[PDB]
Curated annotation (Swiss-Prot), chain A:
Family of this protein: Belongs to the TAF6 family.
Compartments (UniProt record): Nucleus
Task performed by this protein: The TFIID basal transcription factor complex plays a major role in the initiation of RNA polymerase II (Pol II)-dependent transcription. TFIID recognizes and binds promoters with or without a TATA box via its subunit TBP, a TATA-box-binding protein, and promotes assembly of the pre-initiation complex (PIC). The TFIID complex consists of TBP and TBP-associated factors (TAFs), including TAF1, TAF2, TAF3, TAF4, TAF5, TAF6, TAF7, TAF8, TAF9, TAF10, TAF11, TAF12 and TAF13. The TFIID complex structure can be divided into 3 modules TFIID-A, TFIID-B, and TFIID-C.
Designated gene of the protein: TAF6
Quaternary state and interactors: Component of the TFIID basal transcription factor complex, composed of TATA-box-binding protein TBP, and a number of TBP-associated factors (TAFs), including TAF1, TAF2, TAF3, TAF4, TAF5, TAF6, TAF7, TAF8, TAF9, TAF10, TAF11, TAF12 and TAF13. Interacts directly with TBP, TAF1/TAFII250, TAF9/TAFII31 and TAF12/TAFII20. The TAF6/TAFII70-TAF9/TAFII31 heterodimer forms an octamer complex with the TAF4B/TFII105-TAF12/TFIID20 heterodimer.
Pathology linked to this chain's protein: Alazami-Yuan syndrome: An autosomal recessive syndrome reminiscent of Cornelia de Lange syndrome and characterized by delayed psychomotor development with intellectual disability, hypotonia, microcephaly, short stature, poor speech, and dysmorphic features.
Organism: Homo sapiens (Human)
Modification Phosphothreonine occurs at: 104
Name listed for the protein in its UniProt record: Transcription initiation factor TFIID subunit 6
Swiss-Prot record, chain B:
Range within the parent protein: 156 to 207 of 310
Notes on the domains: Ectopic expression of the histone fold domain acts as a dominant-negative mutant resulting in differentiation inhibition.
Organism: Homo sapiens
Additional information: 'Taube nuss' means 'empty nut' in German.
Annotated disorder: Neurodevelopmental disorder with severe motor impairment, absent language, cerebral hypomyelination, and brain atrophy: An autosomal recessive disorder with onset soon after birth or in early infancy. Affected individuals do not show developmental progress, are unable to sit or walk, do not acquire speech, have poor visual fixation, and show poor overall growth associated with feeding problems. Additional variable features include seizures, spasticity, and joint contractures. Brain imaging shows hypomyelination, thin corpus callosum, and cerebral and cerebellar atrophy.
Assembly mode: Component of the TFIID basal transcription factor complex, composed of TATA-box-binding protein TBP, and a number of TBP-associated factors (TAFs), including TAF1, TAF2, TAF3, TAF4, TAF5, TAF6, TAF7, TAF8, TAF9, TAF10, TAF11, TAF12 and TAF13. Interacts with TBP, TAF1, TAF6, TAF10, TAF11 and TAF13. Component also of a small TAF complex (SMAT) containing TAF8, TAF10 and SUPT7L. Forms a heterodimer with TAF10. Interaction with TAF10 is mediated mainly via its histone fold domain while interaction with SUPT7L is via its C-terminal region.
Family as reported in the entry's similarity comment: Belongs to the TAF8 family.
Stated induction or repression of this protein's expression: Induced with triglyceride accumulation.
Role summary: The TFIID basal transcription factor complex plays a major role in the initiation of RNA polymerase II (Pol II)-dependent transcription. TFIID recognizes and binds promoters with or without a TATA box via its subunit TBP, a TATA-box-binding protein, and promotes assembly of the pre-initiation complex (PIC). The TFIID complex consists of TBP and TBP-associated factors (TAFs), including TAF1, TAF2, TAF3, TAF4, TAF5, TAF6, TAF7, TAF8, TAF9, TAF10, TAF11, TAF12 and TAF13. The TFIID complex structure can be divided into 3 modules TFIID-A, TFIID-B, and TFIID-C.
Subcellular location: Nucleus; Cytoplasm
Protein name (Swiss-Prot/TrEMBL): Transcription initiation factor TFIID subunit 8
Amino acid sequence: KLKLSNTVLPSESMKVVAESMGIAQIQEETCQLLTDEVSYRIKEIAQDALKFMHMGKRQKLTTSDIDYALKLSVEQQLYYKEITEACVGSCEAKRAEALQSIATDPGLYQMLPRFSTFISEGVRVNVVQNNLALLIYLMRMVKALMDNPTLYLEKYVHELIPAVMTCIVSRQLCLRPDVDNHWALRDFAARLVAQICKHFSTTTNNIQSRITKTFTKSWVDEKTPWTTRYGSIAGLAELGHDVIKTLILPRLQQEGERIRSVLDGPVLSNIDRIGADHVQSLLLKHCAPVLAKLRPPPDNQDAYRAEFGSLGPLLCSQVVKARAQAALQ
Amino acid sequence: XXXXXXXXXXXXXXXXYQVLREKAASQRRDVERALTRFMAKTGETQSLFKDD
Amino acid sequence: XXXXXXXXXXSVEQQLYYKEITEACVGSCEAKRAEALQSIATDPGLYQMLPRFSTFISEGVRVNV
């Protein structure tokens, strides 16, 4: 890492210094070896004086040291700044006022691309961070974006839809208990999904097919956590009538048996237990009315036999409640 | 040509000069009044009439 | 990073063919009418002047209802 060559004085200048006294005609190698030997003595006396002044404890060498050694624009990002800061901070009136602001904006766009981009990446952050408050904040933000009758949201929707549906995913990585119902509150976000697609299946028709295949691959398989199954069921639930009539009806009974296996056996996966419990809540108190239309309302115990026991007769009881709600008009 | 040959679509000229800068300035006015309404209902507020 | 501008499913040629289809659907001359009818019923492989065609055909249905 270091190379210490011999500092050799040029022998011709040494011959000049020699012949200043007028000695003789001198060859080169003699003066070369003389410069070598004098350099060895100079560097040895230098090592001696450095040992002196590193025992004299100063990093400088004076004359006396070697003498003793000789004893040998702007408003765009302004608006963006304060509305993002109100979007993050929990000033609750300022929260709701920002939401009504976004809902009541004539001609707020061109902030929309940066807006949605923030929404997407903040979603990814709070997926990693699992802060449900920021999640419902972002969902209200999306709700407000939806409620402009000026915002042609179209071209940017492809950023929202991941940012929506990833919120219908995450790998149960919050704290448990109340978050389950907050998972239910994320189903509020699932409401947004239908409130997307009603305005945006206008495609070379892509959107509903996409989301429903996604929910399908979610809903069918095993190795599927209760966050995933729960939220997928929620999104299909918000899709509405014949989605449930056609799609949830078939493996209704099989996933009911999945929950029956979650029932009646082990105890201490109470995440999974109360998860499947308000799954049952989703199934019953969203899936009653389509059978209330289809299946005629005799034969409660037979409907339990026709729909794997457990939903009955609360299926039929909720069907009686729904017939009462229909006749209430 | 209606079956065999094809063409190319650019489809967005939109180059109407005075209309363009009308769009931009109107949008600037929008962002003005938007941030005004926001910090209007946000911070310490005093009015012109009573309770506006 | 501004992306390249889009291009529709159409060509300019076949969208003008589509405009001929539409204004023959308007068409007072019944020869132009029947020409349009045969052009609809026997252009297989068209498929791409599909839905946009049929979509605000249905929208025109609503508006003229």
